[PDB]
């Protein structure tokens, strides 16, 4: 601890340097948003979404984009 103190006052870059190294190694682990990154980027639609044939055996897939079925990004909205 004592050295820590002097280190804070002598060679006070490394201290800050390491501190950041860690804080970046922690915040991701503990945060209410970390999960969003993999989603927000997942959602971003870059490649055309090819439509599947309607065997008529699928109640999950929305038959029309504006239908009340399917995925939503309201999480992205009001984020």
């Amino acid at each position: 601890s004592a050295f820590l103190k002097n280190a804070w006052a002598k060679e006070p870059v490394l201290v800050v340097s390491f501190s950041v190294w860690g804080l970046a190694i922690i915040m991701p682990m503990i945060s209410p948003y970390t999960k969003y990154a993999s989603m927000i980027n997942k959602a971003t639609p870059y490649n055309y979404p090819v439509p599947v044939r309607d065997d008529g055996n699928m109640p999950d897939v929305p038959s029309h984009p504006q239908d009340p079925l399917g995925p939503s990004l309201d999480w992205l909205k009001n984020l």
Binding site: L14, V16, S17, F18, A24, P28, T34, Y36, A37, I40
Partner: protein
């Protein structure tokens, strides 16, 4: 029309180069209780043109022991790269917008280290070689942190294109965030232009190395190069970290503020020069490898983490 634009970017910049020299010789003056050059022309405005003509007229000297190409390639390369790096800069519209723009600026800067290496080998005198070796080292070292500092920026910009930052900085300068790196970009910009606090490349008291055997026209070309760079790097600070206000309806208030911020930060390295003694060769590298590189590498990781857990991953494009 494209040429017209080519002319509009190069000619004005070159003229600005010239007057920076004058401005450097008056702002340093008033800081040191002296008027500076005002007698030639009105208020010294004709002063930059005057020595340009004296420099080109004086006999270019080719040392008995000197390569004749690694000697003439070196100033041509220095002016060519520096004026070239103004090609892809957002003001706000770039002349040649390149999707990987910042990598162009980083790569083109890196090539200038050769000119120093080639000129030092070409001179074939001891002062030149010793100066070049230390110089190349300074420049190269200040490239490793220089590059990492940009990579931290990009990751918060989303792309390598300098044009994107005008849209990233529509609400706040990237100084507020990332100020810790601005400082470290500013100091690295001072090293890479071999300006004062870091002018050991060509220390005068130490080795009166880069232009030892360079006089007249060759002296001028690097010379011109350095000063244009002095501006360019300051201008990159004024786009990457200090984002001038952009209004799509009127594009010139972007350039008007770009004008104001670039001049002030260009004024700052002039002010730094007069204010500080020059660092020692090892004291200079001690800073980058010990003081800055650990700060930069760690803050580099913080800039890969800030995006993810703050769900702020920047939009590509």
């Amino acid at each position: 029309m494209f040429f017209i634009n080519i002319l509009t970017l190069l000619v004005p910049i070159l003229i600005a180069m010239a007057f920076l020299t004058l401005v450097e010789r008056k702002i340093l003056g008033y800081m040191q209780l002296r008027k500076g050059p005002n007698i030639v022309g009105p208020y010294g405005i004709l002063q930059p043109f005057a020595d340009a003509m004296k420099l080109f007229m004086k006999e270019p000297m080719r040392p008995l022991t000197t390569s004749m190409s690694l000697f003439i390639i070196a100033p041509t390369l220095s002016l060519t790269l520096a004026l070239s790096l103004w090609v892809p800069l957002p003001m706000p519209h770039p002349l040649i917008n390149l999707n990987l723009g910042i990598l162009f600026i980083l790569a083109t800067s890196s090539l200038s280290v050769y000119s120093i290496l080639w000129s030092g080998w070409a001179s074939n005198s001891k002062y030149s070689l010793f100066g070049a070796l230390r110089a190349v080292a300074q420049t190269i070292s200040y490239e490793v942190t220089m590059a990492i500092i940009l990579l931290s920026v990009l990751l918060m910009n989303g792309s390598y294109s300098l044009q994107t930052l005008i849209t990233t900085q529509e609400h706040m300068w990237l100084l507020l965030p990332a100020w810790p790196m601005a400082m470290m970009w500013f100091i690295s910009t001072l090293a890479e232009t071999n300006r004062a606090p870091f002018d050991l490349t060509e220390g005068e008291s130490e080795l009166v190395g880069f232009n030892v055997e360079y006089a007249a026209g060759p002296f001028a070309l690097f010379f011109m190069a350095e000063y244009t760079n002095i501006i360019l790097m300051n201008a990159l600070t004024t786009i990457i970290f200090l984002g001038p206000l952009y209004y799509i309806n009127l594009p010139e208030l972007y350039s008007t503020n770009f004008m104001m911020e670039a001049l002030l930060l260009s004024s700052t390295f002039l002010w730094i020069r007069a204010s500080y003694p020059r660092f020692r060769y090892d004291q200079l590298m001690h800073l980058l490898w010990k003081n800055f590189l650990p700060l930069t590498l760690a803050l580099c990781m913080w800039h890969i983490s800030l995006p993810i857990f703050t769900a702020g991953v920047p939009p590509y494009m």
